[PDB]
Every structure is written in structure tokens, then in C-alpha cells.
Paper text:
The hyperthermophilic endocellulase, EGPh (glycosyl hydrolase family 5) from [name] possesses 4 cysteine residues forming 2 disulfide bonds, as identified by structural analysis. The crystal structure of hyperthermophilic beta-1,4 endocellulases (EGPh, glycosyl hydrolase family 5, T opt = 100 °C) from the archaeon [name], that was isolated from an oceanic hydrothermal volcanic vent, has been determined. The crystal structure of EGPh revealed 4 Cys residues (C106, C159, C372, and C412) forming 2 disulfide bonds. The disulfide bonding of C106 and C159 forms at the end of the loop associated with the substrate-binding active site cleft.
To investigate a role of the disulfide bond in the activity and stability of the enzyme, we prepared 3 mutants of EGPh; P74C, C106S, and P74C/C106S, in which we removed the disulfide bond or changed the disulfide-bonding pattern. In the mutant P74C, we paid particular attention to which pair of residues among the 3 Cys residues (C74, C106, and C159) would participate in disulfide bond formation in EGPh. The structural data demonstrated that the substituted C74 residue formed a new disulfide bond (C74–C159). The newly formed disulfide bond (C74–C159) in EGPh was located at the conserved position for the disulfide bond (C34–C120) in EGAc. The conformation of the newly formed disulfide bond in EGPh also exactly matched with that of EGAc on the superimposed structure. The neighboring residues around the Cys residues were not affected structurally by the mutation. The structure of P74C with 3 Cys residues near the active site showed the same disulfide-bonding pattern as that of EGAc, suggesting that the conserved C159 prefers a linkage with the substituted C74 rather than with C106, unlike that of the wild type. The Cα–Cα distance (5.0 Å) of C74–C159 was also slightly closer (5.7 Å) than that of C106–C159. These structural factors may allow the conserved residue C159 to easily form a disulfide bond with the substituted C74 rather than C106 of the wild type. The wild type enzyme was thermally unfolded at 103.4 °C. The melting temperature of the 3 mutants was approximately 101.5 °C. These results indicate that the alternative new disulfide-bonding pattern involved in the position of P74 did not contribute to its hyperthermostability.
Author numbering: 34 to 410
The structure:
């Protein structure tokens, strides 16, 4: 049931790593970071114009992280795709390698450091996050076939825990139109061509056929269906990939022991949500909002919930409420035992969030990290 001898599964709401030969099981927690770049025109994780790739992984490990979420686009996982923006004096062992080979080298090195890797099909093109898992020139079959090829190749790396099926299903128009106009993802609306809960089953099933040992990470949508979204006062103000309110009545039809729900959640640096106003009760109003959008999926329904993205500038060149926001979110995660997450991002070159690293790609933001470090202990 595994090409590596290692099998990942959810027991209760906790992820376990199973050695199938010895029978040994260990619960694991994912203290993760997003290192992005393979999903961009660079076709490689960013920062290698300033840093050595291995030094980066060591620095990540040095801060107590044990997991990396690795966004990719279709092109980066095809042989022959050339990366742009590498300083080869700092990265001599990367000379001659295409994007796929660098991805392999990074995953293998991460594994050597005991770092788990989650593969994230972040973009179909390499420019922006499409609202759906297909485009006019790239069909759902093309999407699934790509995942199959990725699972065949990377399923052989022991430390790859699975597949984040599609980054941030979302809408590009407003409701109630968004539910039916076919431009955006839905959940429980009924049309299997827009319903992410149905698509996730189709894509997930295909992956589990070739990588039965993997977990399937399924993000939220932005809007689900009018009955669900209208059932809660802040039902129309969830993030892309962050609306899991339809899980209760419309659960994804996959084996529970292989499924992880993976919401994204953000603060005032990404969008000035009305509920970030003290006028609306910020920040003491946040736990109930998080609980409704996604928290109940673990606390009430007992599924594995892993926060796939969260982050913000933490008062460095952004909205100073972000400091309060990130502190409250970490407090809530600790209190409710959400111990699995991927911070967005390791990279500093994220326009609305910044990262763990500062713009010099070398020094970390001490305060931002100190808060996060609380989740690690």
C-alpha cells in the first residue's frame, strides 16, 4: 500500500506516519512554511538570486519548522522547463538543471532534514490563481493527468505527505450570480463542473489510485451555495480557499482517513474585512468567525484541519492591526489545538503579507517569528 514503506493517514483528526513493515505509528504535527516560486514565471523557488538553496533549507530547519508547502504550476513539473533568477555562483550544483530537477533536489534535501513536503498545484498557468481547476485551453482531464504524473514521480519520496489539490478555489464575480454563472468555484450548488466538493472527489480518487499512501488536502472555496453562505452573518466574507461552511451538509466523498481539510485565513493586510473593525468587535469577535468558516470542521466534525496559508506583515509596512490579528489567531490555534499549519510565506516577496524573511532574504522578522514560535512551543 506504499512505494516508500511509509503510509500517511488521518486517525481521529490527527495525521499519522506509519511504517508499514514495522507497524510503528507516530502522530505528526506540521509546523510549516510556504516557499513559493515554482508556480511563477521564475519556475523555481524564489530567493536563489540572493541565497544558496541548501542554506535556505537549513535556516528553515533552524527555526523549528518541519514542513514545507511547495506551490507549483503545470510548466514547472514538465521536463525541460528552465528556471529564471538563480545566482549560480551561490548555487553551483544547480547549473544545468531544469525546474523539475531542482524540485527533486529540494524535496530530497528536505527529507534528509526530516522535513515533510506538501505539493500544491497552485496555478494552472504560471501567472495567477485561476478560480477553477480548468481553463478554456486546459481541461479537467489535463489537470487530473498532471496530478497523476506528479503523484507517480513524487510518490517515491518518503517525506512527501500528499497533494493539495488546487490552490484557492474562488469566485471572480459577486453572488448571487457567482453561484451559477460558471466563472467560479461553488460547493453544494449542484453543478459538478463548478462544485469543488465534487471535483475534489474526482481528482482525489485519481491520485489515490497511484499514490494510495498520500493524504488529499482539500481547501475551501470562497462562496459555496446561497443557503449555506446566507446561514451565517459573515458567510460572504470568507477568504479564497477559506470557506469550509459547506463541509457539514456537503462533505467531500473520500475516505476520512485520507482526507485533510485545508482552509486559508488572513488578516487586514490582505483585505480590510468589515469584521476587522473595532466597531464590529475586533479582535474578540474572531474566534466565532474562524469557528464558523472552518474551525468547526475539526472541533465539531472531527476531521483533520490543516491551515494551508496564513500570514501578514505583522506591523512592518502594513496595517498595524495585523499584529493583533496574528496574535489572536495563534492564541486561538493553541487553545483549540490546531497544531498543523503552513505560514505564508518564507519568502519576503509577497506583496500583501511579506514573509518570515525580511527583504534582504537573510534576516528574519524577530517579532513575527516569536509569535509563530508559540505554536511550535
Amino acid at each position: 500500500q506504499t512505494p516508500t514503506g511509509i503510509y500517511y493517514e488521518v486517525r481521529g483528526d490527527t495525521i499519522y506516519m506509519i511504517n508499514v513493515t514495522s507497524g510503528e505509528e507516530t502522530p505528526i504535527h506540521l509546523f510549516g512554511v510556504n516557499w513559493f516560486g515554482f508556480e511563477t514565471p521564475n519556475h523555481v523557488v524564489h530567493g536563489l538570486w540572493k541565497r544558496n538553496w541548501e542554506d535556505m533549507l537549513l535556516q528553515i530547519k533552524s527555526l523549528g519548522f518541519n514542513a514545507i508547502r511547495l506551490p507549483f504550476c503545470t510548466e514547472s513539473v514538465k521536463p525541460g522547463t528552465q528556471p529564471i533568477g538563480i545566482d549560480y555562483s551561490k548555487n553551483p550544483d544547480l547549473r544545468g538543471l531544469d525546474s523539475l530537477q531542482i524540485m527533486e533536489k529540494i524535496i530530497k534535501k528536505a527529507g534528509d532534514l526530516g522535513i515533510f513536503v506538501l505539493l500544491d498545484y497552485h496555478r494552472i498557468g504560471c501567472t495567477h490563481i485561476e478560480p477553477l481547476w480548468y481553463t478554456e485551453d486546459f481541461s479537467e482531464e489535463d489537470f487530473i493527468n498532471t496530478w497523476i504524473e506528479v503523484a507517480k514521480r513524487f510518490g517515491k519520496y518518503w517525506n512527501v505527505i500528499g497533494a493539495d489539490l488546487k490552490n484557492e478555489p474562488h469566485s471572480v464575480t459577486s453572488p448571487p450570480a457567482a453561484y451559477t454563472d460558471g466563472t467560479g468555484a461553488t460547493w453544494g450548488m449542484g453543478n459538478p463542473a463548478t462544485d469543488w466538493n465534487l471535483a475534489a472527489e474526482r481528482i482525489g480518487k485519481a491520485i489515490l489510485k497511484v499514490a494510495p499512501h498520500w493524504l488529499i488536502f482539500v481547501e475551501g472555496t470562497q462562496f459555496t451555495n446561497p443557503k449555506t453562505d446566507s446561514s451565517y452573518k459573515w458567510g460572504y466574507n470568507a477568504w479564497w480557499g477559506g470557506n469550509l461552511m459547506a463541509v457539514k451538509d456537503y462533505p467531500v466523498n473520500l475516505p476520512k482517513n485520507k482526507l485533510v481539510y485545508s482552509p486559508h485565513v488572513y488578516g487586514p493586510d490582505v483585505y480590510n474585512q468589515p469584521y476587522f473593525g473595532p466597531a464590529k468587535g475586533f479582535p474578540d469577535n474572531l474566534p466565532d468567525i474562524w469557528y464558523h468558516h472552518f474551525g468547526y470542521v475539526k472541533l465539531e466534525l472531527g476531521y483533520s484541519v490543516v491551515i494551508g496559508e496564513f500570514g501578514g506583515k505583522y506591523g512592518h509596512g502594513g496595517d498595524p492591526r495585523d499584529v493583533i490579528w496574528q496574535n489572536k489567531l495563534v492564541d486561538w490555534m493553541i487553545e483549540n489545538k490546531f497544531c498543523d499549519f503552513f505560514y505564508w510565506s518564507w519568502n519576503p516577496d509577497s506583496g500583501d503579507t511579506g514573509g518570515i524573511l525580511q527583504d534582504d532574504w537573510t534576516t528574519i522578522w524577530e517579532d513575527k517569528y516569536n509569535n509563530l514560535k508559540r505554536l511550535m512551543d
